């Protein structure tokens, strides 16, 4: 998630893993899925 000049950008990537510990060693990339012209002058967040 980025938020630059009102345009808030969301990249992502959904990928199969088999580990229960933490982020797995390897490489893959995240492709832009949404931009929004939100124009909100932002600071923080919280997950649901």
């Amino acid at each position: 998630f980025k938020n630059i000049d009102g345009y808030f950008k969301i990249y992502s990537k959904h990928t199969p893993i088999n580990l229960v510990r933490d982020l797995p060693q390897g490489f893959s990339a995240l492709e832009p899925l949404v931009d929004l012209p939100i124009g909100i002058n932002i600071t923080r967040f919280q997950t649901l």
């Binding site: 000049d5 009102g6 124009g39 002058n41």
Partner: peptide
Amino acid sequence: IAWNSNNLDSKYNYLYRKPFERDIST
């Protein structure tokens, strides 16, 4: 683009105090 709206808007309901930012609070 801008034009003269005296004959369309003039009659006290147009207030005023990062680029492209709107600050609505007061």
